[PDB]
Design an enzyme around this catalytic site. Structure first.
Site, PDB file in Angstrom:
ATOM      1  N   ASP A 187       0.861  -1.207   0.000  1.00 39.88           N
ATOM      2  CA  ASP A 187       0.000   0.000   0.000  1.00 39.88           C
ATOM      3  C   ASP A 187       0.881   1.236   0.000  1.00 39.88           C
ATOM      4  OD1 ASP A 187      -3.055   1.125   0.484  1.00 39.88           O
ATOM      5  OD2 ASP A 187      -1.723   2.213   1.835  1.00 39.88           O
ATOM      6  N   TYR A 220       3.050   9.688   0.091  1.00 35.31           N
ATOM      7  CA  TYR A 220       4.113   9.064   0.929  1.00 35.31           C
ATOM      8  C   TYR A 220       5.530   9.342   0.428  1.00 35.31           C
ATOM      9  CZ  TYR A 220       0.043   6.385   2.435  1.00 35.31           C
ATOM     10  OH  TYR A 220      -1.215   6.048   2.874  1.00 35.31           O
ATOM     11  N   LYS A 230      -2.659   5.981  -4.531  1.00 33.61           N
ATOM     12  CA  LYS A 230      -3.750   6.847  -4.193  1.00 33.61           C
ATOM     13  C   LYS A 230      -3.653   8.229  -4.784  1.00 33.61           C
ATOM     14  CE  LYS A 230      -3.990   4.572   0.401  1.00 33.61           C
ATOM     15  NZ  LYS A 230      -2.604   4.224   0.596  1.00 33.61           N
ATOM     16  N   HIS A 236      -7.779   9.310  -2.147  1.00 35.12           N
ATOM     17  CA  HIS A 236      -7.106   9.201  -0.890  1.00 35.12           C
ATOM     18  C   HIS A 236      -7.983   9.728   0.223  1.00 35.12           C
ATOM     19  CE1 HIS A 236      -2.834   9.128   0.995  1.00 35.12           C
ATOM     20  NE2 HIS A 236      -3.746   8.912   1.931  1.00 35.12           N
ATOM     21  N   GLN A 238       6.950 -11.376  11.674  1.00 38.43           N
ATOM     22  CA  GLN A 238       5.954 -11.770  12.677  1.00 38.43           C
ATOM     23  C   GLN A 238       4.553 -11.530  12.111  1.00 38.43           C
ATOM     24  OE1 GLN A 238       4.084  -9.661  16.542  1.00 38.43           O
ATOM     25  NE2 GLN A 238       6.288 -10.004  16.710  1.00 38.43           N
TER      26      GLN A 238
HETATM   27  N1  LIG Z   1      -5.577   5.954   3.419  1.00 33.08           N
HETATM   28  C1  LIG Z   1      -5.093   6.766   4.431  1.00 33.08           C
HETATM   29  O1  LIG Z   1      -5.374   7.961   4.599  1.00 33.08           O
HETATM   30  C2  LIG Z   1      -4.092   6.129   5.405  1.00 33.08           C
HETATM   31  C3  LIG Z   1      -3.837   6.675   6.673  1.00 33.08           C
HETATM   32  C4  LIG Z   1      -2.903   6.026   7.514  1.00 33.08           C
HETATM   33  C5  LIG Z   1      -2.228   4.867   7.102  1.00 33.08           C
HETATM   34  N2  LIG Z   1      -2.473   4.377   5.829  1.00 33.08           N
HETATM   35  C6  LIG Z   1      -1.817   3.191   5.245  1.00 33.08           C
HETATM   36  O2  LIG Z   1      -1.961   2.133   6.209  1.00 33.08           O
HETATM   37  C7  LIG Z   1      -0.566   1.739   6.610  1.00 33.08           C
HETATM   38  C8  LIG Z   1      -0.457   1.110   7.994  1.00 33.08           C
HETATM   39  O3  LIG Z   1      -0.979   1.893   9.028  1.00 33.08           O
HETATM   40  P1  LIG Z   1       0.034   2.948   9.910  1.00 33.08           P
HETATM   41  O4  LIG Z   1       1.157   3.506   9.137  1.00 33.08           O
HETATM   42  O5  LIG Z   1      -0.922   3.898  10.634  1.00 33.08           O
HETATM   43  O6  LIG Z   1       0.653   1.983  11.014  1.00 33.08           O
HETATM   44  P2  LIG Z   1       0.148   0.574  11.675  1.00 33.08           P
HETATM   45  O7  LIG Z   1      -0.050  -0.509  10.661  1.00 33.08           O
HETATM   46  O8  LIG Z   1      -1.125   0.899  12.583  1.00 33.08           O
HETATM   47  O9  LIG Z   1       1.413   0.391  12.661  1.00 33.08           O
HETATM   48  C9  LIG Z   1       1.801   1.276  13.711  1.00 33.08           C
HETATM   49  C10 LIG Z   1       3.136   0.749  14.404  1.00 33.08           C
HETATM   50  O10 LIG Z   1       3.016  -0.670  14.709  1.00 33.08           O
HETATM   51  C11 LIG Z   1       4.342  -1.220  14.668  1.00 33.08           C
HETATM   52  N3  LIG Z   1       4.265  -2.680  14.453  1.00 33.08           N
HETATM   53  C12 LIG Z   1       4.118  -3.367  13.300  1.00 33.08           C
HETATM   54  N4  LIG Z   1       4.067  -4.669  13.551  1.00 33.08           N
HETATM   55  C13 LIG Z   1       4.197  -4.810  14.858  1.00 33.08           C
HETATM   56  C14 LIG Z   1       4.293  -5.915  15.683  1.00 33.08           C
HETATM   57  N5  LIG Z   1       4.207  -7.159  15.193  1.00 33.08           N
HETATM   58  N6  LIG Z   1       4.468  -5.698  16.994  1.00 33.08           N
HETATM   59  C15 LIG Z   1       4.583  -4.466  17.532  1.00 33.08           C
HETATM   60  N7  LIG Z   1       4.527  -3.368  16.766  1.00 33.08           N
HETATM   61  C16 LIG Z   1       4.326  -3.543  15.431  1.00 33.08           C
HETATM   62  C17 LIG Z   1       5.052  -0.454  13.524  1.00 33.08           C
HETATM   63  O11 LIG Z   1       6.242   0.006  14.127  1.00 33.08           O
HETATM   64  P3  LIG Z   1       7.697  -0.441  13.493  1.00 33.08           P
HETATM   65  O12 LIG Z   1       7.919   0.069  12.099  1.00 33.08           O
HETATM   66  O13 LIG Z   1       8.720   0.137  14.626  1.00 33.08           O
HETATM   67  O14 LIG Z   1       7.593  -2.009  13.464  1.00 33.08           O
HETATM   68  C18 LIG Z   1       4.119   0.742  13.234  1.00 33.08           C
HETATM   69  O15 LIG Z   1       4.786   1.985  13.235  1.00 33.08           O
HETATM   70  C19 LIG Z   1       0.221   2.991   6.391  1.00 33.08           C
HETATM   71  O16 LIG Z   1       1.637   2.709   6.325  1.00 33.08           O
HETATM   72  C20 LIG Z   1      -0.312   3.378   4.999  1.00 33.08           C
HETATM   73  O17 LIG Z   1       0.108   2.375   4.115  1.00 33.08           O
HETATM   74  C21 LIG Z   1      -3.379   5.006   4.995  1.00 33.08           C
HETATM   75  C1  LIG Z   2      -9.775  11.324   8.030  1.00 34.38           C
HETATM   76  O1  LIG Z   2      -9.192  12.006   6.837  1.00 34.38           O
HETATM   77  C2  LIG Z   2      -7.918  11.610   6.721  1.00 34.38           C
HETATM   78  C3  LIG Z   2      -7.458  11.045   7.868  1.00 34.38           C
HETATM   79  C4  LIG Z   2      -6.166  10.547   7.969  1.00 34.38           C
HETATM   80  C5  LIG Z   2      -5.305  10.603   6.934  1.00 34.38           C
HETATM   81  C6  LIG Z   2      -3.996  10.056   7.129  1.00 34.38           C
HETATM   82  C7  LIG Z   2      -3.105  10.128   6.041  1.00 34.38           C
HETATM   83  C8  LIG Z   2      -1.646   9.550   6.083  1.00 34.38           C
HETATM   84  C9  LIG Z   2      -0.553  10.485   5.525  1.00 34.38           C
HETATM   85  C10 LIG Z   2      -1.587   8.212   5.299  1.00 34.38           C
HETATM   86  O2  LIG Z   2      -0.905   7.309   5.816  1.00 34.38           O
HETATM   87  O3  LIG Z   2      -2.185   8.108   4.197  1.00 34.38           O
HETATM   88  C11 LIG Z   2      -3.590  10.727   4.875  1.00 34.38           C
HETATM   89  C12 LIG Z   2      -4.891  11.248   4.692  1.00 34.38           C
HETATM   90  C13 LIG Z   2      -5.785  11.191   5.731  1.00 34.38           C
HETATM   91  C14 LIG Z   2      -7.087  11.717   5.594  1.00 34.38           C
END
Ligand SMILES: NC(=O)c1ccc[n+]([C@@H]2O[C@H](COP(=O)([O-])OP(=O)(O)OC[C@H]3O[C@@H](n4cnc5c(N)ncnc54)[C@H](OP(=O)(O)O)[C@@H]3O)[C@@H](O)[C@H]2O)c1
Ligand SMILES: COc1ccc2cc([C@H](C)C(=O)O)ccc2c1
Length: 304
Positions: free
Chosen positions: A45, A50, A79, A112, A261
Site C-alpha cells: 500500500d 508518501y 492513491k 485518498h 511476525q
Molecule cells: N488511506 C489513508 O489515509 C491512510 C492513513 C494512515 C495509514 N495508511 C496506510 O496504512 C498503513 C499502515 O498503518 P500505519 O502507518 O498507521 O501503522 P500501523 O499498521 O497501525 O502500525 C503502527 C506501528 O506498529 C508497529 N508494528 C508493526 N508490527 C508490529 C508488531 N508485530 N508488533 C509491535 N509493533 C508492530 C510499527 O512500528 P515499526 O515500524 O517500529 O515495526 C508501526 O509503526 C500505512 O503505512 C499506509 O500504508 C493510509
Molecule cells: C480522516 O481524513 C484523513 C485522515 C487521515 C489521513 C492520514 C493520512 C496519512 C498520511 C496516510 O498514511 O495516508 C492521509 C490522509 C488522511 C485523511
C-alpha cells in the site's frame, strides 16, 4: 489468501503499509518492501503522498527481476492526492504515480480522501472525480478503483450517482479495536464493498496528527491477555481480529523481525468469546484528530 473484489479482481487480505515519516531515509522503503515480499506479503500500500513510490516500485520490480514473484502475484495500491480531485487532474496524477514506480498499472487506485484541497480547501463534485477514476480503469491504468476515508453518506453519493459504471471496490479507513467501524463495515458488506483497515495497529502516533496522550492500542490489557492466551503478540491479535471480521488489513512495520511476525496472522484463530472481548474495546477513538482535517467541510467524521 485473497478476497474477490466486486469487479472480479482479487485482493490479498493482508497488506504491507509503506508510510514512513520524512525523517526516515527514503532508502528504507526499498529495503523494507523487499523484506515484506520475502516474508510473504503480496499486497503493498503506497500513495502519491508518501513520497516513496520510486522506492516501493523498485522493490516490487527488484523482486520480480530476481525471480521471487511475478507482477501478477503482487497487488500494488496507490492513491490520488486531495489536490488532484479535479477530474482533468486524475489520470495525469495516476500516470505520474506509475512513471514513479515504473510499473504498467496499479492493481488499485483510490481517492485518498474526500477532503478536497486547492490544486486551503477546495469544493469539487467527487462524482466528477469518480468518473475520471472510471476512465482510468477502462484504460487499464488501474485494474480496480476505490475510495479512502469516506463515510457512509460520501460512499452513498458515489453509489447513487446517475449512470455509475463501477462501484468503488473498497473503502480504506482508520479501523482498529478502539474504532472498529461496525456500522460502516455492515454498510460496506451489504454493498459488496471491502473495508480495508489502516492504522490497524494503533497508527505510528505521528505528532502532526495524533495526541501523544491517546492510549497506545498495542498496550491494551485485553489485547495483551489474548496475546498471552494465544501465545502470540498484541499486534497479531489486532490483525487477526480484522480478518475474522471480513476486513482486509494493512500492517506497517519497518523492522525486519516484526514484518516477518505479521504474516503469522494466518497461523491461528480467535474464538467467538475472543472476538466479543475485542469488540468490547470500541470507543469511537480515531487517532488522526487534527485541526487540519476537522475544520474541513467534507471531514468524514462529522456524521458520527
Ligand atoms: N488511506 C489513508 O489515509 C491512510 C492513513 C494512515 C495509514 N495508511 C496506510 O496504512 C498503513 C499502515 O498503518 P500505519 O502507518 O498507521 O501503522 P500501523 O499498521 O497501525 O502500525 C503502527 C506501528 O506498529 C508497529 N508494528 C508493526 N508490527 C508490529 C508488531 N508485530 N508488533 C509491535 N509493533 C508492530 C510499527 O512500528 P515499526 O515500524 O517500529 O515495526 C508501526 O509503526 C500505512 O503505512 C499506509 O500504508 C493510509
Ligand atoms: C480522516 O481524513 C484523513 C485522515 C487521515 C489521513 C492520514 C493520512 C496519512 C498520511 C496516510 O498514511 O495516508 C492521509 C490522509 C488522511 C485523511
Amino acid at each position: 489468501q485473497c478476497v474477490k473484489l466486486n469487479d472480479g479482481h482479487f485482493m490479498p487480505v493482508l497488506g504491507f503499509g509503506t508510510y514512513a515519516p520524512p525523517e526516515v531515509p527514503r532508502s528504507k522503503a526499498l529495503e523494507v518492501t523487499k523484506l515484506a515480499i520475502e516474508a510473504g506479503f503480496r499486497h503493498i500500500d503506497s500513495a502519491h503522498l508518501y513520497n516513496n513510490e520510486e522506492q516501493v516500485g523498485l522493490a516490487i520490480r527488484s523482486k520480480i527481476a530476481d525471480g521471487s514473484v511475478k507482477r501478477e502475484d503482487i497487488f500494488y495500491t496507490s492513491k490520488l492526492w486531495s489536490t488532484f480531485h479535479r477530474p482533468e487532474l486524475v489520470r495525469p496524477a495516476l500516470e505520474n504515480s506509475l512513471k514513479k514506480a515504473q510499473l504498467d498499472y496499479v492493481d488499485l487506485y483510490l481517492i485518498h480522501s474526500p477532503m478536497s484541497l486547492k490544486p486551503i480547501f477546495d469544493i469539487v463534485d467527487l462524482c466528477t472525480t469518480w468518473e475520471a477514476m472510471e476512465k482510468c480503469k477502462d484504460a487499464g491504468l488501474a485494474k480496480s478503483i476505490g475510495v479512502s476515508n469516506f463515510n457512509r453518506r460520501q460512499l452513498e453519493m458515489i453509489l447513487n450517482k446517475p449512470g455509475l459504471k463501477y462501484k468503488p471496490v473498497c473503502n480504506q479507513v482508520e479501523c482498529h479495536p478502539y474504532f472498529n467501524r461496525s456500522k460502516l463495515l455492515d454498510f460496506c458488506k451489504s454493498k459488496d464493498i471491502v473495508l480495508v483497515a489502516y492504522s490497524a495497529l494503533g497508527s505510528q502516533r505521528d505528532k502532526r496528527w495524533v495526541d501523544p496522550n491517546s492510549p497506545v492500542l498495542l498496550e491494551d490489557p485485553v489485547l495483551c491477555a489474548l496475546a498471552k492466551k494465544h501465545k502470540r503478540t498484541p499486534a497479531l491479535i489486532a490483525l487477526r481480529y480484522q480478518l475474522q471480521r471480513g476486513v482486509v488489513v494493512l500492517a506497517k512495520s519497518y523492522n525486519e523481525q516484526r514484518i516477518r511476525q505479521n504474516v503469522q496472522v494466518f497461523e491461528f484463530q480467535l474464538t467467538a468469546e475472543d472476538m466479543k472481548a475485542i469488540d468490547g474495546l470500541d470507543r469511537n477513538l480515531h487517532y488522526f484528530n487534527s485541526d487540519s482535517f476537522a475544520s474541513h467541510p467534507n471531514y468524514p467524521y462529522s456524521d458520527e
